[PDB]
Design a binder for this molecule. Structure first.
Ligand SMILES: C[As](C)(=O)[O-]
Ligand SMILES: [Zn+2]
Ligand SMILES: [Zn+2]
Length: 74
């Protein structure tokens, strides 16, 4: 299970790139969020993630979908 500390850190790193504070980021900023967490995904691995959290291809990711995908990755 994710810990409270993991959820809080995932939230904080995401929020660094949510400039308008509405709980969404662009798919182009997902790698920057992951690197902010000290991870180093490949472009490949980023594409697979974007495939899970931006199924419709609108180029946005909300925090709930980011968090469950990370739960699955961790
Ligand atoms: C009003 As908007 C598309 O910048 O969240
Ligand atoms: Zn917005
Ligand atoms: Zn959503």
């Amino acid at each position: 299970q994710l810990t409270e500390e993991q959820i809080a850190e995932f939230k904080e790193a995401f929020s660094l790139f949510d400039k308008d504070g509405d709980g969404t980021i662009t798919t182009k900023e997902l790698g920057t969020v992951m690197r902010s967490l000290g991870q180093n995904p490949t472009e490949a691995e980023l594409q697979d993630m974007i495939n899970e959290v931006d199924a419709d291809g609108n180029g946005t990711i909300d925090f709930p979908e980011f968090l469950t995908m990370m739960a699955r990755k961790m």
